Amino acid sequence: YQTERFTKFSDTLKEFKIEQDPFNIIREFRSAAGQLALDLANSGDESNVISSKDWELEARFWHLVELLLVFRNADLDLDEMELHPYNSRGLFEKKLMQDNKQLYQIWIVMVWLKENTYVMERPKNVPTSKWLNSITSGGLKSCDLDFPLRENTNVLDVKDKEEDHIFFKYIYELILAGAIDEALEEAKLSDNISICMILCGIQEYLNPVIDTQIANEFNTQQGIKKHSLWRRTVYSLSQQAGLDPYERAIYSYLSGAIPNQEVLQYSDWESDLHIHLNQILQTEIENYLLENNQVGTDELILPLPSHALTVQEVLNRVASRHPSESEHPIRVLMASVILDSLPSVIHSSVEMLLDIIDKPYLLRIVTHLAICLDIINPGSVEEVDKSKLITTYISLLKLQGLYENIPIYATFLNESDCL
Amino acid sequence: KKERHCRLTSWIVSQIGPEIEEKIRNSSNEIEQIFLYLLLNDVVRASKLAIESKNGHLSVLISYLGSNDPRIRDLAELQLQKWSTGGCSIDKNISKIYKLLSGSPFEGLFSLKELESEFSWLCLLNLTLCYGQIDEYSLESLVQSHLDKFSLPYDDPIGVIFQLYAANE
Amino acid sequence: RSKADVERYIASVQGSTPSPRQKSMKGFYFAKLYYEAKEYDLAKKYICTYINVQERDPKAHRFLGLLYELEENTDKAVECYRRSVELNPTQKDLVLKIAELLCKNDVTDGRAKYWLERAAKLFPGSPAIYKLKEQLLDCGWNKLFDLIQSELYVRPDDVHVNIRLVEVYRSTKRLKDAVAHCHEAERNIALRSSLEWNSCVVQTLKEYLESLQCLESDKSDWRATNTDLLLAYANLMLLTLSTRDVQESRELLQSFDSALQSVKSLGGNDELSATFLEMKGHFYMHAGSLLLKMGQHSSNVQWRALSELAALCYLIAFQVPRPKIKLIKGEAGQNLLEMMACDRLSQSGHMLLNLSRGKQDFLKEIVETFANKSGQSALYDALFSSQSPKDTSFLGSDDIGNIDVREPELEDLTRYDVGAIRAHNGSLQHLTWLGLQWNSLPALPGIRKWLKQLFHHLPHETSRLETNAPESICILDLEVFLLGVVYTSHLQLKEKCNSHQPLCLPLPVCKQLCTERQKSWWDAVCTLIHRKAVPGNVAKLRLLVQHEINTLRAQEKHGLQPALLVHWAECLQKTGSGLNSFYDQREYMGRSVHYWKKVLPLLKIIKKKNSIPEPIDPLFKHFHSVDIQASEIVEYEEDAHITFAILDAVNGNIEDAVTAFESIKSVVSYWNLALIFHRKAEDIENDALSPEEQEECKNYLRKTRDYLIKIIDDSDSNLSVVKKLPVPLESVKEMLNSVMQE
Amino acid sequence: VHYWKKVLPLLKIIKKKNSIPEPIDPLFKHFHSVDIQASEIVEYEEDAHITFAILDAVNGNIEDAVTAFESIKSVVSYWNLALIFHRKAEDIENDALSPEEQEECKNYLRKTRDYLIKIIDDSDSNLSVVKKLPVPLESVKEMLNSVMQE
């Protein structure tokens, strides 16, 4: 049956033109692609695993589109936040994310990135308690994480290191996926209290009593006041070798830094891009705080880089670092959406019809995207480009023998007359 | 309340300053020094020395001292019970630092009360006031909490003033 | 305020914040009031100091640039805008300004060219963009001509540019080319609707008539150009009456009448003669509309006398026969002429009626009293000043012979409207007017046919109804839209006159009858469909349409009062229930059921006398004038249950449809019961099949006969039931004749 | 039911992929080895709803228990549905009483038979279901023998 696909997308358009909000179209496009992603994936010829991934990718694209256009377009402007110098850093961070839409967009994108991150299954047969092997062998004179750092790592049993590896890797995957609550649960429950505690430093300080404008979200002070310190402390910890590469990786991510080579070598376009947007973000916040004298000089223990990249440049670098992946045609759209250069790319792939015909999803996707765009933002895509796109896709509806559902797509030109 | 607390604790640090600096002068062990820096309510230099002496995890932990995060409090205490039930051996000063993170450094079961004989009473009171459970208590009932654990010398007047302050009701 | 009010506030904040930094940070808010007190050498230094501390504020920098603009210091003003623009790129209007000012001061530097390119991509093909393109060139005749031509290639519908082409032709005194383009451009439907273009058309033609070149060249094409002048006059008259004031409209009439008098003498049997015929009608129609405009403002005695006079004018117009279309040289020309004919009969038609509904056979009196030549002088009197020579005025010399004095037939009127939908480029003004004119009549207009005449091959319903993307726009959406526009418009005007007839206003005289929101949508979807949008503005137009789709389909956060939904539901049921084909029946019934399914939850809350959650900035204004009452709830629930049954029948659930239809003894349920009983009989009626089954088959045909007879019996007895018939009475009788002969 | 009532608030926060507040010196060591995942949440909510229904049945809210049991087609819900349908039949089955009521009483015993048969049919087919039985398979068959001889 699967050669139904176009129906689903077409179907969604029917429902829209007929209850005469348009963001639902895309939401459905997403779900549609996802549903199809499942079909080709389950039981299939290994020629299908490929086009299955091109559907999952499809789906992620629709999601990213929804998220960003919702934020950008459903922008109806709220009330400005008036801080005082007595206010906590927490509030200033919030203010920053409110006022600077460019940067919040980075947040949105990171959220999307996390959403679609793979995490291993929870490690089984985890041991009763930490470093149990070393303790049992005798030779841990101190039971604290820093003991084998104070003096040769030869202290820790091999099996203990192997388990610490399992743990820190799992925690790392969870952190990259946004699963911070799960990471704290794992830390707690796996007898890694001190690491847990480390994960608690992630929050900026708020006090509901002082920072009135969040006395709703909070009933109790929380987060840590000397955060610039925390951050250097963690970063330095991240640079100290004789720690497991995933642990160092974790601290890197937390300090707004770029994890060690041993770990980073396995990160893909999404993972890598995520890492570097995290860096942009971290740097930008800490700079925002410095420009408002909410950082205390004592805390500038160490040099961290102060110069934030632009999303443009991060993308360019990550691209050159992952050319194959970068060049994949829906991930180009992903980037195009991220930079807003989107009608830009529409008109572009339009002129590539004048090695876009070779891949099937593309001509469809661009067309339905163009439709959505001009629905949500009348004017968005050049009238001509709509004409050209629908023209060509329609002729494929004909080549597929689905003339049945051509009128729906017609509802965008007087050129429709000619059908 | 925060303002008053900060001035009181800066002042106590003014007083205990040389005592502790002397003690840091004579220590032969890095983790002990880290602890003493916590005795001067200097979280940052403790964190730094930790970092330098290659005690990095501790270093991170240290950064919590003075945020009263009850999660961290109950976790630190938990770690301490687990050690104090088997725990073949834990360094004498790491346990002290964890006990500081517990928020109840004498009020306790790994207790710093024995430090009664090694430090000015004021020095230990600083520990209760800085870590101790700042948010949940009023300055007065906090100070009172500490005094309830230690008799001060009858003749000492700065002692007397703390007692009159805590005595409130 | 004064000088004291602002300079005394100096000591107000000086005593509140005395440090230099905060003293200078108040400079912008100090300068805020000196700009209001007409102090520009002072306001300049106040803002300039705030700029000394707040050097990154795009608002302050622009404010100084706007102040240097009042000072006419271009070099200083431009630089200020630049800083605000480089700080904040979203300030599009400043990119135009910079480009606007750079081209006016000096073009020698390429910087003026650069900023003009950006200004173009921020405002695709806006009216100002070309203006700047011409300014930059100014700093030679052949050079200007090429710009306009290259500009007209991609922008043929721009009023200003085409005007400039005529002006350039006129500057080189090659007027023959000026009229030539003027003639070939009178085929453009957009330009024909432009007031300023038609004004240019009237002049460039007259200039050519008097021009030495017109006589020398030949007298063969003289008639051809002369036709366009009359056409231009008609279009110009339609527009001048609506926008311009009483004085200007009357003045245009005299030029029109002079032209008519100068043309009638030639006569003949060609396009010019045929054009004179149709334009003659327009003259009176517009003259009648012109008459009614004056009386509206005036007293009652003048109103009746003027409306009496106008009624005669519209009558004269309506009488004028359909022009001889075959007699024109080309297909475009003849179709145009006919289009205008339909417009004349339609507009004058509804006016004739609305004025005749006031009294009984009011029309007869109008003719019997003013058809007399005395009326011709009373018409010339009220319209014009008697001082002008009454000999060369067409109005005074026309032979008013045998006025038909026959009120118009609705069926004829419908085909006039449908044929004239494209008369005024389908402006929502045009349709909302017609829709309102039919709001008082017993026969309803073929809206679905109007839309088919406008957006050809636009599907009735789009397959991809799931999303609101505006590529899925359907004739139903539009039909659903116009219904609300008219239902909304009527209520708004009803409220207006209540505070202070609404039907009686002629189309030009009345103002915008729809909300600018609604008008913006229609203009957008129109430009989009007809493929006359702008590549840059495509995305904006597309979204503008998308915004309203979810309301036309009663989706998330629809700004729809329950009464308007019900009106949509029933208006589509009865619209669909009268259609012949199944495809159309299904669609219209589907949408009707859809809207019904959205109302009933509201009606149930309203049924227990609770409050409806009012909307947020609705698309169709709410009104308590038509708020649903409990007295009418049970009826809608019943009328809806019919609409459900009808769709059940069309889908195949005959058992449930009949079970429902039979439950309510309604005239409409008979026509449905009958129509579906007849089908079960006719198919099985003549093939070889079990005899017992044949008897059961005949039995259904017997039921059909009975239900049709119940319709006619109850129909002839009461008039209210005649109006409830889902199809015409004669159509019901038509079936019965065939039913019984079977 | 008590412990269930304490978990479900946690599962709901875990259902939306948030963080659980870790404990202070817990009595039973936490482990990320068995940390609950979204993949298993809907199951627990279902398995809990059974435990609710079972207690409702034991307390007397048969109407709500059956309404819940029937909602989920689980092997365990059969044994409960069957066990409670059998009791409504057995008590009313032999005393002098309205004949119409007697027919309704027998009707329940007919449902008991059917649910026990569904248990054995699904049980013999698949092993995973055999382990889900709230009581031993032979015990289910034991009742059925007596159910039908009644």
Side-chain angles (χ1 to χ4, degrees), chain C residues 683-694 697:
Chain C
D683 184 6
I684 299 181
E685 179 63 12
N686 239 24
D687 291 343
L689 65 80
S690 58
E692 170 280 345
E693 184 68 13
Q694 181 159 22
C697 174

Side-chain angles (χ1 to χ4, degrees), chain C residues 315-338:
Chain C
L315 196 58
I316 295 164
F318 196 107
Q319 178 191 330
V320 182
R322 183 182 309 271
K324 310 243 177 182
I325 296 301
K326 308 221 208 179
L327 289 181
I328 318 303
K329 176 185 178 183
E331 301 178 2
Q334 67 193 29
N335 187 344
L336 166 69
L337 185 62
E338 190 179 4

Side-chain angles (χ1 to χ4, degrees), chain C residues 361-579:
Chain C
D361 64 79
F362 168 81
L363 188 59
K364 175 61 186 304
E365 285 185 8
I366 300 298
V367 188
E368 187 173 342
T369 184
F370 290 174
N372 187 336
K373 188 181 185 300
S374 175
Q376 292 190 230
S377 63
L379 177 60
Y380 203 84
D381 183 24
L383 287 178
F384 304 81
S385 57
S386 61
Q387 297 300 133
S388 55
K390 203 190 181 182
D391 194 78
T392 59
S393 60
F394 164 84
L395 170 54
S397 59
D398 186 60
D399 299 357
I400 296 172
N402 195 33
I403 304 300
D404 298 2
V405 65
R406 298 187 299 177
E407 273 190 21
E409 271 176 3
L410 295 170
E411 292 181 353
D412 289 337
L413 203 62
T414 48
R415 179 175 58 101
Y416 298 150
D417 291 331
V418 177
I421 284 286
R422 306 219 60 178
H424 302 157
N425 286 327
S427 72
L428 195 78
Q429 183 63 33
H430 187 113
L431 312 192
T432 305
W433 190 82
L434 302 178
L436 281 157
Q437 297 294 334
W438 290 96
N439 215 33
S440 61
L441 295 172
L444 310 182
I447 292 180
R448 64 183 183 88
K449 294 194 208 70
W450 291 351
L451 310 178
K452 208 80 182 188
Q453 195 63 16
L454 285 170
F455 320 98
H456 288 292
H457 297 297
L458 186 61
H460 280 281
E461 181 68 83
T462 298
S463 54
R464 299 181 178 174
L465 202 70
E466 70 287 357
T467 61
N468 56 312
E471 303 178 354
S472 74
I473 189 66
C474 63
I475 282 172
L476 266 169
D477 288 328
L478 300 170
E479 194 174 357
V480 175
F481 171 69
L482 295 174
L483 287 167
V485 167
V486 170
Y487 186 55
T488 297
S489 185
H490 191 75
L491 279 175
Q492 188 60 54
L493 297 174
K494 173 188 292 175
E495 177 179 48
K496 182 184 164 107
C497 190
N498 188 333
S499 177
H500 181 78
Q501 188 170 337
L503 324 172
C504 295
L505 293 175
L507 175 59
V509 173
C510 57
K511 63 181 180 180
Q512 276 190 338
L513 297 181
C514 53
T515 80
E516 190 65 16
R517 184 179 179 184
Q518 295 154 13
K519 180 58 173 172
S520 294
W521 188 87
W522 186 264
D523 290 336
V525 62
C526 285
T527 54
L528 285 162
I529 293 285
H530 300 134
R531 181 193 295 280
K532 275 183 169 162
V534 176
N537 229 27
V538 169
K540 174 52 188 159
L541 297 169
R542 203 179 151 285
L543 179 62
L544 181 62
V545 179
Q546 183 176 332
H547 259 303
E548 310 304 339
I549 297 293
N550 277 341
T551 299
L552 299 183
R553 304 183 176 175
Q555 295 298 355
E556 293 177 350
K557 281 186 169 57
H558 57 69
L560 296 178
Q561 191 178 355
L564 168 57
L565 268 175
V566 175
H567 175 271
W568 278 354
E570 293 200 3
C571 186
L572 281 178
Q573 170 209 330
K574 298 166 186 190
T575 296
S577 184
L579 300 176

Side-chain angles (χ1 to χ4, degrees), chain C residues 103-147:
Chain C
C103 294
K104 188 176 182 178
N105 190 33
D106 184 8
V107 169
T108 58
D109 268 357
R111 190 180 301 162
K113 159 187 161 202
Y114 161 89
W115 277 91
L116 181 58
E117 293 181 3
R118 286 187 60 198
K121 312 203 184 231
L122 288 171
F123 308 94
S126 92
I129 293 304
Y130 171 74
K131 181 205 174 199
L132 304 178
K133 252 170 167 282
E134 173 167 330
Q135 281 211 19
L136 190 151
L137 180 65
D138 183 7
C139 296
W141 274 127
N142 182 17
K143 199 181 191 74
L144 182 67
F145 174 77
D146 294 353
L147 160 58

Side-chain angles (χ1 to χ4, degrees), chain C residues 176-385:
Chain C
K176 179 205 152 191
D177 292 1
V179 176
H181 175 277
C182 201
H183 165 62
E184 88 192 359
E186 284 286 315
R187 183 166 44 88
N188 184 293
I189 62 176
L191 297 174
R192 184 172 51 84
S193 179
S194 165
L195 175 69
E196 301 182 20
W197 164 259
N198 283 320
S199 182
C200 176
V201 169
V202 168
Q203 297 177 332
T204 183
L205 294 167
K206 276 180 180 296
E207 297 294 333
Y208 185 67
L209 291 172
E210 297 158 6
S211 71
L212 185 148
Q213 287 144 338
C214 166
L215 178 77
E216 65 186 10
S217 180
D218 64 8
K219 304 293 291 182
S220 61
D221 299 0
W222 183 86
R223 295 177 62 88
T225 60
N226 195 330
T227 66
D228 292 351
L229 175 59
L230 297 165
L231 290 173
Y233 272 139
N235 303 124
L236 187 69
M237 188 60 185
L238 181 81
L239 305 166
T240 306
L241 279 164
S242 58
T243 66
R244 266 43 178 167
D245 54 357
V246 297
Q247 298 285 115
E248 191 156 353
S249 52
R250 182 184 60 161
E251 295 180 25
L252 180 46
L253 182 63
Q254 204 163 350
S255 302
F256 205 122
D257 183 67
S258 176
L260 281 177
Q261 187 69 54
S262 180
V263 164
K264 76 197 295 180
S265 57
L266 277 64
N269 193 21
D270 61 2
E271 174 172 33
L272 172 61
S273 186
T275 305
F276 166 81
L277 180 62
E278 185 55 40
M279 299 300 97
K280 190 213 253 191
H282 278 70
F283 171 79
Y284 284 97
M285 179 180 66
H286 298 328
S289 300
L290 189 152
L291 278 169
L292 273 171
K293 188 169 191 174
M294 313 186 305
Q296 172 187 13
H297 302 104
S298 174
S299 63
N300 301 277
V301 176
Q302 297 212 352
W303 189 323
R304 69 223 306 172
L306 287 172
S307 63
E308 287 175 359
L309 201 61
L312 179 61
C313 291
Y314 291 142
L315 196 58
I316 295 164
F318 196 107
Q319 178 191 330
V320 182
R322 183 182 309 271
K324 310 243 177 182
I325 296 301
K326 308 221 208 179
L327 289 181
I328 318 303
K329 176 185 178 183
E331 301 178 2
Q334 67 193 29
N335 187 344
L336 166 69
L337 185 62
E338 190 179 4
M339 196 194 306
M340 302 179 67
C342 300
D343 182 12
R344 182 200 59 194
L345 297 173
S346 44
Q347 188 173 182
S348 61
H350 294 90
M351 296 306 303
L352 282 161
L353 294 174
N354 289 279
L355 301 176
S356 70
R357 303 198 86 80
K359 336 184 180 177
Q360 182 180 343
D361 64 79
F362 168 81
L363 188 59
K364 175 61 186 304
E365 285 185 8
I366 300 298
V367 188
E368 187 173 342
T369 184
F370 290 174
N372 187 336
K373 188 181 185 300
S374 175
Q376 292 190 230
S377 63
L379 177 60
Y380 203 84
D381 183 24
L383 287 178
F384 304 81
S385 57

Side-chain angles (χ1 to χ4, degrees), chain A residues 244-259:
Chain A
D244 188 279
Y246 284 101
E247 177 174 15
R248 305 204 309 277
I250 289 160
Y251 305 143
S252 285
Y253 189 91
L254 300 188
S255 335
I258 296 185

